[PDB]
Symmetry: C3
Subunit: 959 residues, 3 copies
Amino acid sequence: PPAYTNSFTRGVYYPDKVFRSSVLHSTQDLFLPFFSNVTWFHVIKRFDNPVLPFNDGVYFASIEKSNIIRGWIFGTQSLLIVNNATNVVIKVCTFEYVSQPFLMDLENFKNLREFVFKNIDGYFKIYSKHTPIDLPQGFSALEPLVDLPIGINITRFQTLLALHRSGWTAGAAAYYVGYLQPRTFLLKYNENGTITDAVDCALDPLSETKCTLKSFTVEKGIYQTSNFRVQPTESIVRFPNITNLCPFDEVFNATRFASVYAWNRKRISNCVADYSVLYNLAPFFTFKCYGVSPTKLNDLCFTNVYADSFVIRGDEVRQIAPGQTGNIADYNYKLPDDFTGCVIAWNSNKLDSKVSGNYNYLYRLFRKSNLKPFERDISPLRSYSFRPTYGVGHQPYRVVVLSFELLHAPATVCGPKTNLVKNKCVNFNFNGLKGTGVLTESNKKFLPFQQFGRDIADTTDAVRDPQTLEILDITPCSFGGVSVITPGTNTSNQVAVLYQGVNCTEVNVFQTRAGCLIGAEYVNNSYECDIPIGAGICASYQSIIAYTMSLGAENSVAYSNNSIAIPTNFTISVTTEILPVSMTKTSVDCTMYICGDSTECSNLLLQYGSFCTQLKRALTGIAVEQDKNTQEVFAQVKQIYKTPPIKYFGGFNFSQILPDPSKPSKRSFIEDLLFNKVTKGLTVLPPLLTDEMIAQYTSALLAGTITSGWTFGAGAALQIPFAMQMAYRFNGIGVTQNVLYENQKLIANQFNSAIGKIQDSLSSTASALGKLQDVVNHNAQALNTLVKQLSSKFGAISSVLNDIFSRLDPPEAEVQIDRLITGRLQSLQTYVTQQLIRAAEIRASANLAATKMSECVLGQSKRVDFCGKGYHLMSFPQSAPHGVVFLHVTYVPAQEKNFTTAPAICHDGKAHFPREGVFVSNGTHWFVTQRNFYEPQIITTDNTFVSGNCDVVIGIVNN
Amino acid sequence: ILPVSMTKTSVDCTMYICGDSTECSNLLLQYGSFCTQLKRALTGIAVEQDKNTQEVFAQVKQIYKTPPIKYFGGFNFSQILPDPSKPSKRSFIEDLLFNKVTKGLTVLPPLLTDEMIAQYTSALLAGTITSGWTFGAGAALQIPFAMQMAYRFNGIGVTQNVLYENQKLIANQFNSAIGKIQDSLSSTASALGKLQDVVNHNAQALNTLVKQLSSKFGAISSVLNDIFSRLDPPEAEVQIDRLITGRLQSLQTYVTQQLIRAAEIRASANLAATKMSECVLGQSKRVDFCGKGYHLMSFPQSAPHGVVFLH
Amino acid sequence: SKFGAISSVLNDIFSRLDPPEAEVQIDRLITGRLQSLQTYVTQQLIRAA
Ligand SMILES: *[C@@H]1O[C@H](CO)[C@@H](O[C@@H]2O[C@H](CO)[C@@H](O)[C@H](O)[C@H]2NC(C)=O)[C@H](O)[C@H]1NC(C)=O
Ligand SMILES: *[C@@H]1O[C@H](CO)[C@@H](O)[C@H](O)[C@H]1NC(C)=O
Ligand SMILES: *[C@@H]1O[C@H](CO)[C@@H](O)[C@H](O)[C@H]1NC(C)=O
Ligand SMILES: *[C@@H]1O[C@H](CO)[C@@H](O)[C@H](O)[C@H]1NC(C)=O
Ligand SMILES: *[C@@H]1O[C@H](CO)[C@@H](O)[C@H](O)[C@H]1NC(C)=O
């Protein structure tokens, strides 16, 4: 029986004969799906190998051992490959090809053969691969062997098997079946330029996330990938279907008609008419319709409608034809040559037969001159000798014709050209008004003359059907982008798809206030947020779940009316702030960028005005302001400081930051890992301050801020003890120097553990350089579009300006030059403007970083939550590509404790207040402690002052 | 008043320019990654908006809460602090703000909805009131309000005895001033100038955006079918290219000024976070930064896409 | 700035080309100078920020 199995990762071929190295190139072509239900075939007693159609195109593989498959038959010219005992021959009998006896080379299974059959645009590509191998572990790139311009289509292929005859037994055989449909793979090339993986953008949500990120390792986070829209389903065509009604009673069921010369002309206008009446009645047999096609009457409508009623005889109907003349034709009525009219004929014997005899018809016979078209004569009369002995074909026949005319007046007569849908995201078309949305009830009452209402946003919001008098509300149908909830591949592999404000009734499964969510099960509990999902939804892995973002550490403060709690401990938590102080300054030659060495390009471009010059001026301003930012950020001091050759800093270890004399490039480990982690027509100008000089300024700034304190920003550096300096910094954050004095070595120990955690976090944190890498990505992608918009082949025969010149006359070749250069110049100008705004943002950030350097490093900042979280102490710089990294010291308190405090001790009528401390008790003794730390001190007459009496202090006590 | 958020949006470039027209989409997709630049710049705007919102409101990961027993010793903050009896947990001042203030594109919801922003503001108030400024630097170290204001007067150069003799009178002055704030916000159309105008700027920015689609540029019909039916296909293609490139330039220009306000209000919101640090999360020595004059105290309040303070 | 116009100023286009095509070429200069104006305004906004 046929068997089904997973195709896994087979079918990866190079698209053409173009080699690419170390690129993640993604291209669109006919490709075979991944993880497909590939049928397994076996031949054993039974023989089930029916005809295998070609369809669009077939990827076929043969797991061949001992060369049992020898050839096939291709035909509907037909393609065949034959291998006799000598060599291998390829035959198409238009197309011929000779290659190698590969299939004869043939150099339990020891080998596996691989084949490719591709047939588009008359080019037939085969890739050959001998793979010496329940699937054995291995892989092979599909080498491009041959391309043959067959120019033929073969709509079927067959399978041939080899038996053994002297009994006879048919061996077990298998083959693989798949087909190519246009999709877009994503590749990877290793150091040796070989494919190791291919992922389409259209198999999996994981696959398309990979396609978007262009990186096969994913850290974590919510990524936007695509959009969701509800596609329309039906075509709605609406017109005056019912409404009024056209006059047909006196046209068809009128009792009496008129004579030809006095033919009745009447106006039919502004009425609803249906064409199905004549079509659905049998007697109206003859419908040969002149000048205008009756099928397209649903599209074309004339100015007005005329219905002429008249009576003619039988034998002279044949005489009415073009190219002939006669008495009746030249003196009664001459038909138009361009007659755009439509005729109806039927039997009317009951309406034409009279027993008493019809002798009341008159007509005008004598005329002085020939009648002209669209003319009437009223300026001699014969009676028609009609007799009942007339033949079957000579009896009078009634014909009624509708006549239409074309004039300058607008078409005032047009009929309906239908059904009304309800409550579906489909098209609504009311007299030419198109749209897309849902149709719901409308609570708003219009006025009878008003049809189309609008909202504030100047959009169609309400509509009423021209035939059915109901007001409807057109709410926009569900709209939302496709964003993927997928954590790092190091943790999971499942995907989750989110829909921004869209109900899944248009697509376990969970419905949120952002719509419906597919791929996670909602959790009613509260957990700390990790990745924001939307509208207060966050995910935490403990599979993929989504829950309303818990606020965080939900807590109720223990407000006290008479008691205080002050921390007795803390931590020096040190973090990283990364501020990009510069960017990749660029200066672009306009003429080079557009055409370079093209004389005509250069001459015809430089006369287009000062565009290139002004853009270059803007870029030069950009470059000089990066140089200025570097000046303001780094070179705020002109006296080059160097630490003494002894790298001793009072027990504080700084081995990972100082410049190292061992390395000739003066490169610290932190900037080492930063360098490792960071990643024609392009111009990069070297920094005015190279990495070496930037590092030297960092060294000098450190020398100042450690050895000589914060004075070096005010001129010459003033030598000052480092721990008295840090005591001053504690004083600046409201902490007494005794805290540092009695915590000297231990605070050193926490400082060392903190810097070690810093270096570990920098080493193991791929997101620490996120902003810098982000700036680099802007630079890169801007350059990519900037360059690629010119030399893109786009799969045409030739994309050469000289090719256009050779294929066109010079007058229009110059026009093509103009169009091309204008397009490229506009693209460049857009790039430059984007660069300008990015530069302004970087300029703001750079002023920010200069302020950080000045107020966090060259001195202490009391401005909380600018130089790091909490009361900020001091900071350290370090170099970074086009940027800088600042390490901050912050006093973060911990280990809070309630304490028994007194407002005033009323002794001898005096209420006692301190300048800075708070009086507290441990239970048996009363001590004074400061604001941001619990530090008891002796309460004497010296260290306290009496201000006010006891009748104003809240909390009178006796002690 | 400081604008904080904007009506963040992401524009499907193809849907914007063309709609569901397969011909227009096929034409447009060959014009390069300008659309990708547009979308990704807008995504940068959105993530910037969310991170400004987080810096402004989720400055503390730990969420302190106001007890129903609001025993402040006679300092009633009912109009700023949402009442537990009030169903949707929003301040009356927020209600005044909200009822005072007033396709093919999207509006993304804030990560912190109106309720969650209000809750963040409530946590900030609880910290800065019951526990004072230290909750920015760590745990909300509880500290009684009269002595917290005594610390503030020691900040501006006043002894705590002066407060204790003046506690009742400054309380009455403060509550009367709060009443004046209530009346001024209720009756003052110019009280919300900055937020109302930034909401405007977003609004008529989007409005000129949508009317740009109504800029005909001299053709017969913006739907491609009429152009093809009444014109030769070769010239129809070129006119299609002209119209779509005009609209593409318009969208690029719109997002250009959108980035311009992105930077502007980003700096403003940085200032807002800085002044919650210096004004809510502590005392500022800065002049003309927590309002006019020496600073004493501040109370943040939620607002549509922005914040409002009573310094 | 020529902007692909055989004459760079409006009155000279009027004098040098018949009105039916002079109007369209004037339109082309109008949109080019418009581009220039938006560029200048964007520089103005950035500088003023
Ligand atoms: C304050 O906290 C620090 C750590 O946060 C404490 O330091 C630790 O003290 C214990 C007690 O002997 C030692 O075993 C640890 O080795 C210390 N840590 C380190 C990194 O060395 C300190 O003792 C605390 N002080 C008070 C008064 O509570
Ligand atoms: C400080 O720690 C570093 C870490 O490697 C060590 O090399 C150094 O000897 C220690 N002591 C001093 C005084 O730097
Ligand atoms: C102080 O005591 C109260 C009593 O309920 C308790 O809730 C609070 O956590 C205590 N605070 C400290 C810092 O010990
Ligand atoms: C409180 O501290 C004092 C001195 O620091 C000490 O003498 C006393 O014993 C302490 N109280 C208790 C209950 O131990
Ligand atoms: C404070 O204001 C509220 C609301 O305006 C009012 O109900 C209350 O009586 C006022 N006074 C106190 C002490 O709460």
